[PDB]
Swiss-Prot record, chains C, D, E:
Signal peptide: none annotated. It is found in: Virion. GO terms for molecular function: calcium ion binding; lipid binding; RNA binding; structural constituent of virion. One of its GO terms (cellular component) is T=3 icosahedral viral capsid. Belongs to the icosahedral plant coat protein family. Its main location: virion. The virus particle has a shell of 180 protein subunits arranged with T=3 icosahedral symmetry around a core of RNA. Each icosahedral unit contains three protein subunits. The chain holds residues 81 to 279 of 279 of the full protein. This is Capsid protein. Keywords: Acetylation, Capsid protein, Disulfide bond, T=3 icosahedral capsid protein, Virion. Residues 190-199 are annotated as: P domain, projecting. It comes from Southern cowpea mosaic virus. Residues 4-189 are annotated as: S domain, virion shell.
């Protein structure tokens, strides 16, 4: 049994998220969770969207808690994708990382393909990743559509917690004031398409482990 | 050596707060901390102030974190006081608990004295309590000015997290809609005085242990 | 010290204070320019630097009847907002309070003894691990200021942390002097420059 | 080491110099873009990097009869002022100088020869240990430029250091070509990006 | 070592020289104040010190075609006379000399490079062992000056030694800039004082 596939018509995956895990050592607090991040859809043409890997931006929950603390450090951050359409849908996905907040985004798949977590897959694929979201014991991720921060090669040792707006304002002065506020931005591409009008494909989840560190009341944190 | 006191001129106490402690079991999260709650000052005359023992109201930090979760349960809540003036300052302090949000506050010390944590002391006293704030190993609290919830005799098994404003609005409809939103309110009295104009005395700290329970993003919690 | 690096330790009054009827909240950057005057005049002839250790301590100087308190704590992202209240301040990294007349058990830190009793030293020391930058440039108050004025986020690379001191307490609407705050540091002086040329 | 990490070592021409009657002070940013046009074209393909080593050497091209001297020192606060006098410059970090005709004992750093004489060699290597940032991003002059002009303190985020070179000598108030500056580096390249997209 | 004791090492420009037709003899006190303007600004912050090491090196700035020679020797009785002739000067303590164009093999002391050639290098290091006084106080020129003029024997209390430099060479009876003298020291600073108060 080798070199023999069986093309399904649909990949089913049932996500049942696990409760957040929080645990405090003396001054550091460690949080590990996973929330859903974005929903994706394909078009006849390329489409590059992008995301800040900062805690406010990563999760709806995250932001609300992580905000009670002055500066964090990522320990792990994973973007993993999961399909919703049948294996008949046309179009693939691509993601990779970028780091100088002043760099323009790629416009070509060609381009996109040399970034740090370059990963790509037909839009109907992705169910291998499931354990990462569920966080189960992974089977064989050979084929998953995951991307993970290169946590150890970030520029700052720690980063302050920033609110979107504070960020923005800053960035607006000079885009690379930004280069402190965030360690990296994730880049997404949806090409391959069939409809000129968007077809919804999959959705992707974030899974992190962050160090929290110098308590502040939320109201004062920007 | 018995029945012999030595009147100091001032009670010194150095508070050095301990880092918050958070620890998650599966769905419940447990938080234990202590923050400063109020500052007190005396006057020639009685003065009854009062406080809601709900998480938003208890601490500046608390509120910001506790807000990421749907409903909590108190496990412990302590109000402990500490002096700042010399043992020459006139006026004592009193605190006790109240529970039907519709009940009018006491106006007499007499009155005040039959409430659930009735505790009182000259305004210059209080340094016995220190361990509770520092949380050290307590020496002899015989004479401390502390008050603690009667956690096991609260009305609801769990309470939803309420924002001040949401509370208020509710209360405004009918004061005892309130009776769900909060398990009890602390009552403070400052009499004894000397100046007609307020003299600052001590300050009091809150020390809690709360159960957190059915995660919600902050933005949606009211 | 190496032939490249200089290590310097010292003590100094970083600042003097009083208390009033009401609250007053100050803040002082934990930058060698602002920590004391000597550090200033010395550090000044070095381009970069690194805090090996830094600590603020208080020493009472008023009567046992002066009524009041001191509260110190640390902030680390200059975009953040100085606590309004003491309340907010009791939640910062390093919170500490004490009656304005207590604190002389701390004298050993200005001294260098081995405070057996650190139990009642009103002191505060920086979490140098958790600092964001490996090293820091020597900024002058001015330059710093002007810089911030553009977009506070920039202060984040100009400095490790800001100390917040609250002085609530009082009897007079008239400030009454209570104490003094001294600094104890072990700076890591780093790549010479001629004073005059530094900002 | 070669994974996702790329290491490469090279040696090229950073720039050429000439002397006048008076003193002229220049500065070079020490970033991959501005160090040489080669590295520049190679490094653009990666998002951020860190200097494992870099160093400037000067090689004479004159007769023994020219009149001048080169000087150089590193500076690290994109915000401080350039020296304005030999003396000032004299206490920068790699202070090094000599007559515009001396220097040959430097091929070696260029050359990549093991040569037990540094005897004299107008060479200055960076103190690649005491850089502010763990790593630095690839910044393209024009951007740098732009940013630095918002506030001359942002650059501090973007570059580990700046070389100062002063040409003082003077025979003629005309400009005399005296030699060249060569950079010798070992850089560690790291998050590949399409070249075209790197500001 | 860094307690209450501070050690630091630096290297800077002590002074510049030029040659005439005739012989000119100068002298430099070798005290922190007068050694350089950097040390000077750093040392003022401390009450007394002792030289662990100090040394002057000369670096050419001319063409190979200048005409002169520098000479130098240390002297230790603020009361004896300056030499008046090469010969005399010839038997001072670091006697060293060469043509104003030689010397490059000295960057090294400046440079802080290990270089197996002192082959020739117009360098003179102090015999930091045979100083009269255990330590010396920080004296500020104008004071020194003043005192020495009471009796030229008080200075002997205030400074460990004096450098003598003679510029003899002569092409022109006009003054020709030939190079500079650089000091390289390792000083041990000791009883901190407000700068402003140190005479
Ligand atoms: Ca912040
Ligand atoms: Ca609610
Ligand atoms: Ca500077
Ligand atoms: Ca770039
Ligand atoms: Ca003196």
């Amino acid at each position: 049994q080798a070199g023999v596939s069986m093309a399904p018509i649909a990949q089913g995956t049932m996500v049942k998220l696990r409760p957040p895990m929080l645990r405090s050592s003396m001054d550091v607090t460690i949080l590990s969770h996973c929330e859903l991040s974005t929903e994706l859809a394909v078009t006849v043409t390329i489409v590059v969207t992008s995301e800040l890997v900062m805690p406010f931006t990563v999760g709806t929950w995250l932001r609300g808690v992580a905000q009670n603390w002055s500066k964090y450090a990522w320990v792990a951050i994973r973007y993993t994708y999961l399909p919703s359409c049948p294996t008949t849908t046309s179009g693939a996905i691509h993601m990779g990382f970028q780091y100088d907040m002043a760099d323009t985004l790629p416009v070509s798949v060609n381009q996109l393909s040399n970034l740090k977590g370059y990963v790509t897959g037909p839009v109907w694929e992705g169910q291998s990743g499931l354990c990462f979201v569920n966080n189960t014991k992974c089977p064989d991720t050979s084929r998953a559509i995951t991307i993970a921060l290169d946590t150890n090669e970030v520029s700052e040792k720690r980063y302050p917690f920033k609110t979107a707006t504070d960020y923005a304002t800053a960035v607006g002065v000079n885009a690379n004031i930004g280069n402190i506020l965030v360690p990296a931005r994730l880049v997404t591409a949806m090409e391959g398409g069939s409809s000129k009008t968007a077809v919804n494909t999959g959705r992707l989840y974030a899974s992190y482990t962050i160090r929290l560190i110098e308590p502040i009341a939320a109201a004062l944190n920007l």
